Amino acid sequence: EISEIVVCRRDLISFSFPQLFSRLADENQNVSEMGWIVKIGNGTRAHILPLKDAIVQGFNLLIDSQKVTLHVPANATGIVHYVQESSYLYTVQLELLFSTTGQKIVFSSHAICAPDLSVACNATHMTLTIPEFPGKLESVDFGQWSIPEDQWHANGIDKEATNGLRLNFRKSLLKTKPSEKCPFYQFYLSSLKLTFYFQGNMLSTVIDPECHCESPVSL
Amino acid sequence: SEIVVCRRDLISFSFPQLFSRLADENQNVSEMGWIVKIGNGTRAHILPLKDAIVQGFNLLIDSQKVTLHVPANATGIVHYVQESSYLYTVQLELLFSTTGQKIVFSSHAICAPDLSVACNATHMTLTIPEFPGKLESVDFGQWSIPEDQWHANGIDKEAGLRLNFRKSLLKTKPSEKCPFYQFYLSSLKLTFYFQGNMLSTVIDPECHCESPVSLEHHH
Numbered sequence: 389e390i391s392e393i394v395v396c397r398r399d400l401i402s403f404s405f406p407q408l409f410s411r412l413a414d415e416n417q418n419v420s421e422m423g424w425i426v427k428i429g430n431g432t433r434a435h436i437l438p439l440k441d442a443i444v445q446g447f448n449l450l451i452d453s454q455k456v457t458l459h460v461p462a463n464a465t466g467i468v469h470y471v472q473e474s475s476y477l478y479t480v481q482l483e484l485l486f487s488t489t490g491q492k493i494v495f496s497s498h499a500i501c502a503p504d505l506s507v508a509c510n511a512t513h514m515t516l517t518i519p520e521f522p523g524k525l526e527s528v529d530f531g532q533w534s535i536p537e538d539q540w541h542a543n544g545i546d547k548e549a550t551n552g553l554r555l556n557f558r559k560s561l562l563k564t565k566p567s568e569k570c571p572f573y574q575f576y577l578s579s580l581k582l583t584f585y586f587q588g589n590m591l592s593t594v595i596d597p598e599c600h601c602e603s604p605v606s607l
Numbered sequence: 608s609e610i611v612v613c614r615r616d617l618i619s620f621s622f623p624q625l626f627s628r629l630a631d632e633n634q635n636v637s638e639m640g641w642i643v644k645i646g647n648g649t650r651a652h653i654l655p656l657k658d659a660i661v662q663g664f665n666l667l668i669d670s671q672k673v674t675l676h677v678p679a680n681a682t683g684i685v686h687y688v689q690e691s692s693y694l695y696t697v698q699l700e701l702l703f704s705t706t707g708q709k710i711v712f713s714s715h716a717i718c719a720p721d722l723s724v725a726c727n728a729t730h731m732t733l734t735i736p737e738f739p740g741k742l743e744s745v746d747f748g749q750w751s752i753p754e755d756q757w758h759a760n761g762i763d764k765e766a767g768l769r770l771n772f773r774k775s776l777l778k779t780k781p782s783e784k785c786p787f788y789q790f791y792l793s794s795l796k797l798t799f800y801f802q803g804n805m806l807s808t809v810i811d812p813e814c815h816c817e818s819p820v821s822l823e824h825h826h
């Protein structure tokens with residue numbers, strides 16, 4: 389269903405599009421008679437940049453025969469930010485345009501990044517808080533298969549809407565790892581995929597939530 | 608770069624694939640995913656290719672070229688009739704789309720195949736209906752004669768719009784249509800400052816056929 393690869397990173401979101409019908413080369417930028425434009429956001433909230441200015445801001449465009457990759461700084465204007473109860477998620481609606489005389493090629497993708505979700509843990513459960521945003525959670529995938537809502541409870545997943553969206557996981561589902569940051573171990577999940585009904589489509593985010601200590605150690 | 612061919616009942620747009628290879632052998636292409644738009648802004652009439660084909664549009668493609676035939680009765684064409692002279696414009700956007708990628712071919716044609724053409728002893732005279740185009744250049748072949756040189760080169764403007772050409776600028780030929788000879792021009796390009804842009808029409812204006820004198824024969 390999805391062909392581009394979206395990766396949320398610390399300071400950066402990477403979009404990689406395959407060249408299904410385009411024949412663009414790395415040379416075809418910063419050259420006469422052709423131009424790249426980066427748009428982030430929707431409608432009047434959409435922020436438009438010529439590639440030159442975007443490069444100055446820390447964007448990077450990479451092209452080879454197989455794919456077109458755009459690295460987007462997480463503070464790019466047009467990103468929509470959702471903070472609630474110290475939990476943080478943001479969305480990136482990208483349109484990347486190559487234009488020549490009488491022709492345009494447009495790569496489109498809408499990313500959900502949620503590295504700073506608030507994660508609380510007690511004796512029996514891990515609890516994620518997901519800020520309210522246009523996405524409605526419809527599936528949770530630990531790796532093997534995509535668990536729909538009507539099967540969450542049986543598989544140890546419990547949703548609570550008393551405030552915002554709290555997603556609970558039985559401690560039995562959690563992995564353990566040693567840690568020197570939250571001494572001397574912490575529970576966590578690896579490559580948890582959350583899928584949302586987001587503005588009429590299915591869109592996922594991948595996260596590695598870990599329980600947090602009140603005061604962690606760091607030098 | 609695109610080729611626009613205006614006929615009475617049909618306008619042909621042929622686009623090169625300079626930076627794409629859409630419809631190459633490793634791809635399967637269908638009428639699905641194609642959209643035809645004719646007109647500007649909210650006057651643009653949008654058809655899926657399936658419906659446009661019903662109406663008499665025709666799309667033919669290979670990896671090197673994309674050709675769209677647009678019926679002259681297409682919804683969205685702007686029609687200009689004045690003083691028995693007829694000119695019309697076709698603002699085309701042709702889109703091929705996948706879920707995350709699209710290519711858009713754009714061209715704005717000015718067609719005047721049925722422009723009214725009158726000729727007398729000394730001049731050919733074209734009548735151009737009033738429309739958003741301001742005539743700025745006339746190109747017979749080699750170079751684009753701007754307004755400030757028209758009079759010197761035998762071109763005189765008269766006011767919707769009458770454009771006079773001294774007969775010295777005209778070619779002559781016999782034809783099965785005009786067995787003696789006729790004055791004419793081939794691939795005359797008129798260039799207009801059109802809504803902040805440059806737009807041209809190419810036309811083949813012809814005088815009525817010349818009349819030969821009777822020859823007496825055997826008696």
Ligand SMILES: *[C@@H]1O[C@H](CO)[C@@H](O[C@@H]2O[C@H](CO)[C@@H](O[C@@H]3O[C@H](CO[C@H]4O[C@H](CO[C@H]5O[C@H](CO)[C@@H](O)[C@H](O)[C@@H]5O)[C@@H](O)[C@H](O[C@H]5O[C@H](CO)[C@@H](O)[C@H](O)[C@@H]5O)[C@@H]4O)[C@@H](O)[C@H](O)[C@@H]3O)[C@H](O)[C@H]2NC(C)=O)[C@H](O)[C@H]1NC(C)=O
Nearest residue numbers: 726727728729730731732757758761762763764765769771
């Ligand atoms: C076939 O059709 C022709 C047009 O459809 C028609 O030509 C017109 O005929 C009338 C009546 O005979 C003439 O009327 C006379 O006009 C002059 C005006 O002087 C000049 O006008 C034009 C262009 O003027 C341009 O001037 C500035 C720069 O100076 C430009 O920016 C701008 O383009 C203006 O339009 C010019 O062509 C004239 O040319 C002269 O020289 C030739 C040489 O043989 C002559 O043939 C021509 O008749 C004229 O003498 C001239 O420089 C005015 O002073 C008079 O009092 C009179 O009113 C039009 O000028 C003439 N127009 C053109 C473009 O030729 C033909 O008459 C018609 N033929 C028949 C048989 O019906």
Ligand SMILES: *[C@@H]1O[C@H](CO)[C@@H](O[C@@H]2O[C@H](CO)[C@@H](O)[C@H](O)[C@H]2NC(C)=O)[C@H](O)[C@H]1NC(C)=O
Nearest residue numbers: 509510511512513514515545546547554556557
């Ligand atoms: C650990 O936290 C979870 C959720 O954050 C608590 O689970 C809920 O507890 C309330 C009562 O406090 C019940 O009404 C809900 O049905 C529980 N939901 C789930 C999914 O278990 C749990 O009680 C907390 N445990 C402790 C010891 O505080």
Ligand SMILES: *[C@@H]1O[C@H](CO)[C@@H](O)[C@H](O)[C@H]1NC(C)=O
Nearest residue numbers: 429430431432433434522587
């Ligand atoms: C996005 O912008 C378009 C205008 O380009 C508007 O019609 C649409 O309602 C916007 N979507 C949202 C969710 O605001």
Ligand SMILES: *[C@@H]1O[C@H](CO)[C@@H](O)[C@H](O)[C@H]1NC(C)=O
Nearest residue numbers: 399400445446461462463464
């Ligand atoms: C935005 O992020 C870039 C790196 O992605 C960084 O260099 C820059 O200082 C940041 N600007 C602000 C205002 O945070």
Ligand SMILES: *[C@@H]1O[C@H](CO)[C@@H](O)[C@H](O)[C@H]1NC(C)=O
Nearest residue numbers: 630631632633634635636637
């Ligand atoms: C086109 O579709 C056919 C099925 O009708 C499939 O067998 C073939 O592999 C496709 N061609 C290419 C080049 O992918």
Ligand SMILES: *[C@@H]1O[C@H](CO)[C@@H](O)[C@H](O)[C@H]1NC(C)=O
Nearest residue numbers: 646647648649650651739802
């Ligand atoms: C063409 O449409 C755009 C909106 O797509 C509008 O802003 C503009 O005014 C229109 N131009 C003309 C000449 O009507």
Ligand SMILES: *[C@@H]1O[C@H](CO)[C@@H](O)[C@H](O)[C@H]1NC(C)=O
Nearest residue numbers: 616617662663677678679680
């Ligand atoms: C429009 O013109 C095309 C030919 O260019 C023809 O096939 C079609 O029937 C015409 N439509 C109408 C409504 O006359």
